[PDB]
Amino acid sequence: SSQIRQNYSTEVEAAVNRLVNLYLRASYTYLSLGFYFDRDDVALEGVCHFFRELAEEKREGAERLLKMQNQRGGRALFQDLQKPSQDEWGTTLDAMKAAIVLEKSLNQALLDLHALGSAQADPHLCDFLESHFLDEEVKLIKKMGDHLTNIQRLVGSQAGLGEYLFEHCTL
Amino acid sequence: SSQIRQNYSTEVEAAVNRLVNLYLRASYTYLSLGFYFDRDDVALEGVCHFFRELAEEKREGAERLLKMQNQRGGRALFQDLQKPSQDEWGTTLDAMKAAIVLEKSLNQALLDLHALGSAQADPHLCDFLESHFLDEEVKLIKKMGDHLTNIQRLVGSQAGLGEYLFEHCTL
Amino acid sequence: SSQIRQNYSTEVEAAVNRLVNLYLRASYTYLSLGFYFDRDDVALEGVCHFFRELAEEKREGAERLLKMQNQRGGRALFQDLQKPSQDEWGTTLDAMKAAIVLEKSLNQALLDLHALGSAQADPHLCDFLESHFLDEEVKLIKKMGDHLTNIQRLVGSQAGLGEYLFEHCTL
Amino acid sequence: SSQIRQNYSTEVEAAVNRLVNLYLRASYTYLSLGFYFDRDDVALEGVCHFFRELAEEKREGAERLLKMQNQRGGRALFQDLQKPSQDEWGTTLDAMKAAIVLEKSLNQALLDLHALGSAQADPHLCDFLESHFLDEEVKLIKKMGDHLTNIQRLVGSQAGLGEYLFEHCTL
Ligand SMILES: [Au+]
Ligand SMILES: [Au+]
Ligand SMILES: [Au+]
Ligand SMILES: [Au+]
Ligand SMILES: [Au+]
Ligand SMILES: [Au+]
Ligand SMILES: [Au+]
Ligand SMILES: [Au+]
Ligand SMILES: [Au+]
Ligand SMILES: [Au+]
Ligand SMILES: [Au+]
Ligand SMILES: [Au+]
Ligand SMILES: [Au+]
Ligand SMILES: [Au+]
Ligand SMILES: [Au+]
Ligand SMILES: [Au+]
Ligand SMILES: [Au+]
Ligand SMILES: [Au+]
Ligand SMILES: [Au+]
Ligand SMILES: [Au+]
Ligand SMILES: [Au+]
Ligand SMILES: [Au+]
Ligand SMILES: [Au+]
Ligand SMILES: [Au+]
Ligand SMILES: [Au+]
Ligand SMILES: [Au+]
Ligand SMILES: [Au+]
Ligand SMILES: [Au+]
Ligand SMILES: [Au+]
Ligand SMILES: [Au+]
Ligand SMILES: [Au+]
Ligand SMILES: [Au+]
């Protein structure tokens, strides 16, 4: 059973298991994104590598949650990992948009679990999320927003392309 | 506009801009303090260096807030930086007293923004302040209180001066 | 008071204090420019870094002036730092144009203070400006003019973009 | 005779010879100051070393002027070096006051020679003084003013002594 569990509600335990599922599903979505850009008829290896690295980060996030589940004396329970929402991911722009949607949904789930932990007076959980997940997600979303802007600029116009080249190759 | 902003209230955005102003104003006060002690008719270079280093720390605090503003998808807005409250800063004791007043006012502003973030259920903001600012301010205020005590002891009496020398040159 | 002041007119002392203000205001303008380009909806990090580095250079210029003020036995007096002329800075081209306007205004202020020092027969001041500021400003303005030309070329046309790429990636 | 002399007035040549004399006399005054503080009944070796180092700097200043005299095709002419104005130099405070008087008189002589060079349209001379002497004198006078303030503070009072110790042994 558990000799260790203290101040760890069944509501948080359940929500932690759900968040693990969401992180693993995110990892799986990114695996699909990465191999799509590795297709010979797409062939954007930088984009492939970006998404494959994100698959690894999301997996690592799930494993940290699972480690924490056991540290608190909760019981990891795994569900079906639903296949990604698309089989083909369109352009770099389409993919980066789908990625930011995905991250904002993980972010919201983190914030929801944080609010639950707060309601349950579970400061360990709250700190765990703050320390390992909330700032990581904020940083990643800012980087993806940056990328979305640059992709839009580059695909949009002569002026846009110009500004990118000056910044990248001069500054 | 912003593709990234999530769970980031207009109230916090505004308060962050105000706190940047207060940190920059603090930095400017410390620049003035440092150059006052560099005057040939004051000539306390250790005191000058202490305040100039604080000017840099307060600037760095503002820049971290501005970075965070952008990471959250808020919009940095800058105001007039009001000149420091004094043109001449009196003795080392007067200056260290003015410094602790200034830090306690920054501290209170941090605590006020923390309470706002808490009311707004913005755990990212709360953690950001805790991790980068609240303990830094507590440590600095304790160091300034230490200094105030030693300055008072040294300027006050034979017994005071004695105790300082034993501690400094023997212990 | 001052045991050291020699050949240092009240007119130069005052003008030095004003120039410190202008350099600090320039630094503040560049802080605003840098964080604008760090926005997720602008996202030109090279441009951000260029302006943030200029903020630091302008701050260092003010500190050197303040050091010189004290070395001559003048009294540093600080005024309100007026907020930058814009909250949003437009394109890279708009920003680099605003930057060169700003530098030419600092340059003219340097030349005006130089003429004053010359009228006042203050060769120390004249040399200080020549040695630490006039050539620095000339070099920076030439670099910004270079940048303005390249930005215009890159945003302007196929021929322009072509010439830039050949120069950058071949030569 | 001189195959090299160009744009080098007899007025500047003469004034350069006089300035060499003043620098050598300053060096001699500092030699006397240094050995006075080496007396067993005075015994302030730090003060001795400060003045002996200044004797060397003033000698080096004269030698640089003499080198410049020859580089311009002028003729070094040496006069009697008058013995220092005092045989005994009183307290550290008295000595540092006499030192700043001496430096201000060298400084004024530099500024006078600068004005002559300017009147004579001799930019080489003007630059030579600016580059090797005017800023050196400004820095040294600021350091002596600093010292005068600290000596006065230390000899004056409990509060003064206190402030010095805090700055020196804490900051
Ligand atoms: Au890849
Ligand atoms: Au929480
Ligand atoms: Au919490
Ligand atoms: Au909590
Ligand atoms: Au908490
Ligand atoms: Au929390
Ligand atoms: Au590039
Ligand atoms: Au390129
Ligand atoms: Au200093
Ligand atoms: Au908070
Ligand atoms: Au909180
Ligand atoms: Au919070
Ligand atoms: Au919190
Ligand atoms: Au908090
Ligand atoms: Au000591
Ligand atoms: Au001591
Ligand atoms: Au940057
Ligand atoms: Au000048
Ligand atoms: Au001049
Ligand atoms: Au001049
Ligand atoms: Au000049
Ligand atoms: Au000049
Ligand atoms: Au290139
Ligand atoms: Au290229
Ligand atoms: Au000595
Ligand atoms: Au001159
Ligand atoms: Au001149
Ligand atoms: Au000249
Ligand atoms: Au000149
Ligand atoms: Au000159
Ligand atoms: Au000491
Ligand atoms: Au001591």
Swiss-Prot record, chains A, B, C, D:
Keyword Iron assigned: yes
Keywords: Acetylation, Cytoplasm, Cytoplasmic vesicle, Iron, Iron storage, Lysosome, Metal-binding
MF-aspect GO terms: ferric iron binding; ferrous iron binding; iron ion binding
Binding site for Fe cation: 53, 56-57, 60, 63
Span list, region Catalytic site for iron oxidation: 53-60
Ligase is among the record's keywords: no
Note: In horse spleen the light chain is the major chain.
Subunit structure: Oligomer of 24 subunits. There are two types of subunits: L (light) chain and H (heavy) chain. The major chain can be light or heavy, depending on the species and tissue type. The functional molecule forms a roughly spherical shell with a diameter of 12 nm and contains a central cavity into which the insoluble mineral iron core is deposited. Interacts with NCOA4.
Protein name per its UniProtKB record: Ferritin light chain
Organism: Equus caballus (Horse)
Name of the gene: FTL
